[PDB]
């Protein structure tokens, strides 16, 4: 009716605002930091999408886990994730953050960061190219675009 229309357009407004102003915190743990730094380099340029480079970790929207999560930095990863204001998303970049990677059978590596944090986008590669990470960021934006927070709020 009318209220469904209003909450649908307000979902469209807040989803537009949240996807078009993504502020990433980057766990640049390993080699995938280099390729995120190329995704912020002038060719691909995350900042023209609204995705600012070197955002503050205190007020970031998406945590890009770019590198090998070891067992020694898993609680620091979870602590930085717990200090993020909602809505928080997590892009897992590269094979070691996705599933352990080349160090999957190591004694000291968390087999994918999804054992530690909830992951929204898995970006595959060793490293995935800066274009592939920007593909994953745009897929995250599309995932935010089809959120239905106020429509599900209205239907409950």
């Amino acid at each position: 009716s009318r209220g469904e229309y209003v909450v649908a357009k307000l979902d469209d407004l807040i989803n537009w605002a949240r996807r078009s102003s993504l502020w990433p915190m980057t766990f640049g743990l390993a080699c995938c930091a280099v390729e995120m730094m190329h995704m912020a380099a002038p060719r691909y340029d995350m900042d023209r999408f609204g995705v600012v480079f070197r955002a503050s970790p205190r007020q970031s929207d998406v945590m890009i886990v770019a590198g090998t999560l070891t067992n020694k930095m898993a609680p620091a990863l979870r602590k930085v994730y717990d200090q993020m204001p909602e809505p928080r998303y997590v892009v897992s970049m590269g094979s070691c953050a996705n599933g352990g990677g080349y160090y999957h059978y190591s004694y000291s590596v968390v087999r994918g960061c999804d054992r530690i944090v909830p992951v929204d986008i898995y970006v595959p590669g060793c490293p995935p190219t800066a274009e592939a990470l920007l593909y994953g960021i745009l897929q995250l934006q599309k995932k935010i675009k089809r959120e239905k927070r106020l429509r599900i709020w209205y239907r409950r």
Binding site: P42, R43, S95, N98
Partner: protein, 176 residues
């Protein structure tokens, strides 16, 4: 066969001393740096319009995996397990049996793309060009298990990308 960076003693005549004092008091190197930043203000930026423009790639590029076929529809993989013998991540898992016409083919061909290090040793170990690593890099998923490819996903990637994979192998097989 060696040079001395920063072993210059500056001239102490009144001309050079007044030069350095003018540099200090009038900020000449700072205006030089402002001029260099201003010079990049008026250049065309190096920014490509992704996704409507794509970064340049070569035919050697190592992206998403795919299982190929002969020009008859017969799949090239004859279950020889060289690719999982050489796979440095052990991302490849293969089982096999003789299929219903007696042919040496696989029943399992798994590649965990989240173990995979995308180094292309499987495509260079493969004696029949069956496993290759295609040009697709735009295959980010939303769930972890969508990147645990079985044989049907890899054969669909082969059928999906063969028109491009065969041309890249055509461009690069003489270097191999």
């Amino acid at each position: 066969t060696y040079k001395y960076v920063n072993l210059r003693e500056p001239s102490m005549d009144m001309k050079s001393v007044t030069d350095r004092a003018a540099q200090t008091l009038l900020w000449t190197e700072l205006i030089r740096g402002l001029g260099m930043t201003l010079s990049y203000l008026f250049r065309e930026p190096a920014t490509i319009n992704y996704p409507f423009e794509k970064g340049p790639l070569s035919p050697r590029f190592r992206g998403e995996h795919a299982l190929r076929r002969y020009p008859s529809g017969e799949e090239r993989c004859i279950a020889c397990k060289l690719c999982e013998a050489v796979c440095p991540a052990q991302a490849i898992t293969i089982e096999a049996e003789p299929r219903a016409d007696g042919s040496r083919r696989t029943t399992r061909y798994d590649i965990d793309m989240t173990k995979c290090i995308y180094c292309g040793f499987c495509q260079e170990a493969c004696p029949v060009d069956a496993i290759v690593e295609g040009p697709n890099f735009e295959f980010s998923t939303e769930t972890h298990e969508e990147l645990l490819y079985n044989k049907e996903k890899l054969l669909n990637n082969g059928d999906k990308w063969e028109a491009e994979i065969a041309a890249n192998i055509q461009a690069d097989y003489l270097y191999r």
